[PDB]
Design a protein around this ligand. Structure first.
Ligand code: E1U
Lengths: 365, 365, 365, 366
């Protein structure tokens, strides 16, 4: 009955959890758990190679790219990306596009490893994407960074921005494998698995093979792309269970139609909620501009643009009473945030859509 | 049945694995999985806090020590310890006591963050602990590092070394909570969970509160002791499932007598195997001197001190037939290695002892 | 359990059936049943007018197109469209495109009212759409008739054919509102409600308001478009409960994203089965050319192109054991047929997908 | 306050029937699906439509040489189907019609699209009597003879089977089907829309003598041709599945309540109660129908005088609505008031109308 709208960690497919439970003590007859499996065993090698193959198949990752699994989460790459690539040009300069709290947090962290320049003026509110033609690009910057889907503010890119040839690093934790991606146009793609492709503990990094070996001396070996790609993500003990869990979610995404089907489902799910917001006569207020609205995270306010606290509290109370969890928005924005990742089914969204329709009919004047 | 002598990741109690399977779809009635549980929820707040209380209770950790859980493994702390502590004194000096492959791997990693001096002369073989008298310690060094138990060579510190009052950093990955420890005498203790306390993905780090804030600028925020201690290991999304697993094994260690029983049990298991080697008339050979023999990892050879490849291959084949897994020694030293961690029961080592006894009764001339 | 893959009548949305049950004895407080309700009441006026507005909204029906609700089902319009239109031009001639059994049946029925020419050469097997250019069109033919989706053979038009300006009559019974349709290019559209939009009893007809009045003298008044349009489908007692049922299913279609979202789900469901048949190495055989493959009805054979009767029997038996109903193919073609109409959810097709995968895994040589 | 539904068609259904439909609306008898989801070619629905035909034959004593089929199109559809299937029975394509009200007139007009229609009796100044059969001018070369047993709008009902000198007899019993026993052997075709007396709207029952098939015209739709449908056992195409299932439940209800024989005596009790209030009303209620042709199903009347007091008739219908007595307003073509007393309308219901009519008269009569 529970409907999980968690932002990250998020809901996993009910079928996947069932298989994890069934073979938790005896993984496919081997006689041990995955939690007990040695990463150097023949059994676990099959698992991590399976997960890598699925990432390449679902995203159509070209052969000239390395797919590695690292620890540290998404914030772990906020440090790993500068340590590995800011030395690509001697200037130690990097361009960062700040559209929300996660690219903002990633830009601050990047200052520890070089001179970082934000490409646009600070917005009064994270409600739109600055026009790419208004970008002040440093031609001598090592790379250009941006976040494809801002989990907190609901700002999402529906394009690959033109960085005039610079190597492009992208933060896709909030929409990884929610749509087909042209991997060739990037330099490094990373995403914490705990949002749309698995459980917390493991982070996927897709690196172009010509960008290895530019890591600074202060880069940890466990976070250096050249080291981990040189050991097939087995330089040290990797999060074995988080990779096994992720492999099942990938297998689930494949059986449901790859990334092209996840793109269509995200359109149906997000639009079902957005139609109610646009037709709410101001009852529900999404501050993001229509052209940059996220399809994975929908933050809105109730009553007015600043939010009626009593009205939003009774919204979350009846939501919890109806067993719809984790609808409260992030602490920095407040209000309501609905997360609609791959595992969140249409029935889940329909449950919320009917609830938002009846909450309006009984509170709107 | 199956007996898992894994060196890391290693065997977990059957009591623990049974509970993880039972609650995997609906943890304690909340309606979701731990894999779906958000690290900001009151539910997960209870899990990670209870894990800290157990770490402080079972080890009797003083109140002036911070207990944080980080990603990256013990190989991650090989860079985190220099990042957080090598700037404790302006010289960027540190003393390392290489007693095995993991100690040497940590010192080599630490050379990217300062000037590393290996304390004692390089032994021809990792067969003993150099007497602490012969230790040449720079008194203006930031810290002194050593590995209490070497996984590949089976040399263990049955004492806390006298570093003449310097801050002491130790690597107890392979013997953490295998015995009581006087925490007050240490500066920083770190251990990977995956070979005595739980599943891979998380690392315990016990740091004295006065040692925070000396981190370098290149230290990733997810690996800075000051940062994670300020957010109670929730600065970013932590390995939620790995801390849930660790708490259950910690609870299991508590019900079975705590650290005082873990040392008494680890004596019976190591004595039962070491007496067989000492009575083999050369059939089994352990090159480690008895005053440094590990109670956790017992590597040995068959036939002669150099290793009879014919007898050792037949030893592992017959062992695999008896469903005794992961007895093959590390890929560098070769031979046999028996890991006798906390979850390894006395019945488990008795099956190994009976197998070693009868195997000698069929191949000794 | 129970997963209904019915050809027609087909599955209804579980939410709809729940509301029909809740208000069967007291429809919205009026005090009576819709079964007891008079078609000349103001209450049924809201019902039939709301159903009309949904047909107009969901299909974007122009204001110069009449929408009437008749009895007689699909085969009723096989006689209704010639009686109403074959006399548009003095020749009493009509062009008919036969792509399957249902277009052939309508072609045979039209022979009772004029000169009926089949446009293409007769096909050896209904596996492809004869290319629109090889069509022998009559310039003086009163109308051109084709079937958008052949329910028995799985041949669906993914395009609106060019008939050189003739009035176009299409039979969309088995794909009505499964995809957006350009109503302006059609002259008469009809669809039996029982397959994708309602329950058996009522037929939707969309007629351009300038094609009325060409009715032959022998056209029954209940089926004459001019008469029923001039009485708002109330010339006689209409199938009230069937119209009320369709109004709720149309409401369900709207709440789930309209005709745009139905098409995206149609592709996900249909391709999920087609991928299984194509990757089956000849175990499942679907004769339809891939460009004309229906997204609603998927008929195939098991074992070989001719069909392994013994193998197909275990399939339908085991499928019935798993509560997957009405998967037996049509009696004239045999074999299997999966009907994936609007109410059939992705969860349902995934069950059918996992079943076909395992069945192949256990019976292929 | 419970609703009293005097609906003229669609009309009231038995409460216990509506309870069963509601009960098994999502899981019909454990099959796992609804009747609304049921395939017409399944064994489950095969029992439903066969049990419905068996009930029609049993309750009406239909001889074995008659076909019982369930068609769509309502009664007005049969207005075309009867000439389409039968007007070609004789070469002249002639048909005799007996017009006693609005529905027999509407049927005679519709039959002119398929042949030469002749009304056998001189026109009636008002639909208040059945013209004496001795005054009928019957064509011996007519394919059939048509008449309407019960006129819903005008309240004129046959209490006899007319002698058509041996012709093929066709009768429209939609508003009195299974309200009384019928000697089916006297008829060639009997049809009745189910929405009025034996279920819900959507399906039409037709009883055809098996030797009358195969005279259909080329222009008869296959779904309305008796030969085609009787050959496929009403399953030439998808039939109104739910309406055939609802009809069987109403038929089973009639059987459990005494069958056609009991429905006739109950219809007498109900109609008498109202007709006695009218005749004793001293002109306050005015029913122009002559007593020997008064219908036991539909009782239309006026208030005040023969032409109708509109104010008094407006207060009557308004006070009846606040008492939850629905559909008492007469047909829009005649106006006035129409009380329909079909099988499902209980004696307690007619009593509520009877008491209200006595209280309304005691309060406005002069
Ligand atoms: C394309 C198309 N046109 C007409 C019909 C029939 O509608 P009806 O005339 O209302 O039955 C149908 C109904 N299809 C059903 C018909 O099955 P049937 O042979 O009637 O049992 C099927 O495919 O099984 C249809 O799919």
């Amino acid at each position: 009955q529970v409907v999980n709208f968690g932002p990250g960690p998020a809901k996993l497919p009910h079928s996947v959890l069932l298989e994890i439970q069934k073979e938790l003590l005896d993984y496919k007859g081997v006689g041990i758990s995955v939690l007990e499996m040695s990463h150097r065993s023949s059994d676990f090698a099959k698992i991590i190679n399976n997960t890598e193959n699925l990432v390449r198949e679902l995203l159509a990752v070209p052969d000239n790219y390395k797919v590695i699994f690292l620890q540290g989460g998404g914030c772990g790459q906020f440090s790993a990306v500068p340590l590995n690539l800011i030395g690509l040009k001697a200037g130690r300069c990097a361009d960062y596009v700040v559209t929300g709290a996660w690219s903002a947090k990633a830009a601050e962290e990047a200052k520890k490893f070089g001179t970082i320049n934000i490409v646009h003026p600070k917005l009064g509110s994270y409600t739109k994407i600055p026009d790419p033609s208004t970008w002040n690009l440093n031609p001598d910057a090592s790379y250009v960074y941006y976040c494809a889907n801002e989990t907190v503010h609901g700002v999402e890119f529906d394009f690959i921005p033109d960085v005039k040839g610079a190597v492009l690093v992208c933060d896709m934790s909030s929409n990884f494998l929610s749509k087909p991606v042209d991997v060739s146009k990037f330099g490094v793609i990373f995403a914490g698995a705990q949002k749309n492709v698995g459980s917390a503990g493991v982070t996927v990094v897709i690196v172009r093979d010509d960008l290895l070996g530019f890591a600074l001396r202060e880069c940890p070996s466990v976070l250096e792309y050249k080291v981990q790609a040189g050991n097939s993500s087995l330089y040290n003990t990797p999060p074995c269970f988080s990779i096994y869990v992720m492999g099942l979610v990938l297998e689930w995404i494949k059986n449901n139609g790859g990334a092209a089907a996840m793109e269509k489902l995200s359109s149906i799910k997000s639009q079902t909620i957005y139609e109610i917001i646009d037709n709410s006569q101001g009852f529900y207020v999404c501050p993001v501009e229509p052209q940059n609205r996220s399809k994975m995270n929908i933050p809105f306010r109730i009553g007015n643009a600043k939010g009626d606290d009593a009205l939003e509290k009774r919204f979350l109370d009846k939501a919890l009473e109806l067993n719809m969890l984790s609808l409260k928005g992030h602490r920095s924005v407040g209000g309501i945030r609905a997360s609609l990742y791959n595992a969140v089914t249409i029935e889940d969204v329909q449950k919320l859509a009917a609830f938002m329709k009846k909450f309006l009919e009984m509170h709107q004047l």
